[PDB]
Structures are given as structure tokens and as C-alpha cells.
């Protein structure tokens, strides 16, 4: 399907969850982008004003697209594949409790998966893949993409 046709990609954080320290949100998102730039030719840059390729949004319930959120649990986040406008954007359900650790829902881990979608990946049937569509906490300090994730992304880029 669709991929970004350029190497320099921008992101912007639209708003911040009150669940976390601001700096921790910035760092979780930055690290999640780094996971993918590690294994592709892409470069990601945070911008503070204007139109970014990938807008990161925290919202609850109905929030202006065809993917209303469902309160605590269930759908944690969703993202749109590469394209103009809302293409690339990643939305996180504010009815979750976002964290830097094993409590609540880990923002970094969720964001790695969502950014996969923002870059054009679909879901994997392999439970070991970050793109497996079921949330399960794993240690973030030593996180690695599965072989399936790497072959998926390198089928699109590089
Ligand atoms: O992209 N959104 C989805 O696939 C919807 N499922 S999810 O929110 O439980 C979810 C989100 C992110 C994960 F890493 C795992 C599960
Ligand atoms: Ca939810
Ligand atoms: Ca966009
Ligand atoms: Ca919340
Ligand atoms: Zn949405
Ligand atoms: Zn998904």
C-alpha cells in the first residue's frame, strides 16, 4: 500500500496526556520513532508549529474521525497510513492511563506499533511482532523488533 516517498519525515505532538510528565511523553515518542529509523533510511524530526507529516494526538471518545474511542481498555490507539491530511496521524485514547513503565498502558510500546501503521505497516499474525494487534507489556529498556517487523518495514523502505 501507501508509503512515504521522501526520507525526511516530520512529526508534531498536538497535545499532551495529563497522565505523564511532558518530558516523558516527548522522550517516549522520540524513542518510538528511533526504533523505525534504526532499520530504514528514514529521518524523523519533531516540529513545534505548522503542518507535520505525522500528528500525534491524545483524545477520548468521538474526536473528529471515523474511529471513535471506547473508554478505558479495548482500543488503545489507532493510526492512519501514509498520505496527505490525516494520513500518518497517530491517535492515543486518553481514557487509557499512559505510563513510562509496566503500569497502565506503556506509551512507548504502543507508539512503536502506531508509528508502524503511520509508515504503512499492517498487522502481523505473529505474537512476537510489535505489529501483532494485541497489547502486551515487554521490558522497554531492551526492546527489539521481531524478524517479522524488520522484514515488513524493509519490504516498504530501504
Ligand atoms: O493500531 N491500533 C490497533 O491495532 C487497535 N488495537 S490496540 O489498540 O489494542 C493496540 C494498539 C497498539 C498495540 F501495540 C497493540 C494493540
Ligand atoms: Ca480504549
Ligand atoms: Ca498527516
Ligand atoms: Ca488518560
Ligand atoms: Zn482517531
Ligand atoms: Zn494496530
Question: Residue 130 sits in a domain of what CATH number?
Answer: 3.40.390.10
Instruction: Tell me, yes or no, if 114 is annotated catalytic.
Output: yes
**How far, in Å, CA of 62 to CA of 78, rounded?**
13
Catalytic residue among 114, 119, 120, 129: 114
Atom of ligand 1 nearest to the CA of 114: 1
* Beta carbons of 29 and 77 less than 8 angstroms apart: no
Closest by CA to 118, choosing from 49, 65, 42, is: 42
Atom of ligand 1 nearest to the CA of 79: 1
Resolution, angstroms, 1 dp = 1.1
Name the nearest CA neighbour of 134 among 66, 75, 58, 72.
75
Give the domain range for residue 118.
Answer: 1-158
Number of separate domains in the chain: 1
Helix (H, G, I), strand (E, B) or coil at 99: strand
Give the CA distances from residue 15 to residues 26, 31, 33, 56, 63, in Å, rounded to whole numbers and listed in that order. 11, 18, 17, 8, 13
Please tell me the distance from the alpha carbon of residue 81 to that of residue 115, in angstroms, as a whole number: 9
Does residue 113 line the site of ligand 1, with CB under 6 A?
yes
Pocket lining: 76 vs ligand 1, CB cutoff 6 Å: yes
Question: Ligand 1, from 58, 71, 75: best to mutate by most atoms within 8 Å of Cβ?
Answer: 75
What distance in Å separates the CA atoms of residue 102 and residue 33, rounded to the nearest whole number?
20
Question: Which residues in 122-132 are b (16+ Cβ under 10 Å) and which e?
Answer: eebeeeebbbb
Amino acid at each position: 500500500g501507501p508509503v512515504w516517498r521522501k526520507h525526511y519525515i516530520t512529526y508534531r505532538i498536538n497535545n499532551y496526556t495529563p497522565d505523564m510528565n511532558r518530558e516523558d511523553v516527548d522522550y517516549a515518542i522520540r524513542k518510538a520513532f528511533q526504533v523505525w529509523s534504526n532499520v530504514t533510511p528514514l529521518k524523523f524530526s519533531k516540529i513545534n508549529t505548522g503542518m507535520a507529516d505525522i500528528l500525534v494526538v491524545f483524545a477520548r471518545g468521538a474526536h473528529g474521525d471515523d474511529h471513535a474511542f471506547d473508554g478505558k481498555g479495548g482500543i488503545l490507539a489507532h493510526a492512519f497510513g501514509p498520505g496527505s491530511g490525516i494520513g500518518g496521524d497517530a491517535h492515543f485514547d486518553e481514557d487509557e492511563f499512559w505510563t513510562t513503565h509496566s503500569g497502565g498502558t506503556n506509551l512507548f510500546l504502543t507508539a512503536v506499533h502506531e508509528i508502524g501503521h503511520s509508515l504503512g505497516l499492517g498487522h502481523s499474525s505473529d505474537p512476537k511482532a510489535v505489529m501483532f494487534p494485541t497489547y502486551k507489556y515487554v521490558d522497554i529498556n531492551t526492546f527489539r523488533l521481531s524478524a517479522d517487523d524488520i522484514r515488513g518495514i524493509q519490504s516498504l523502505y530501504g
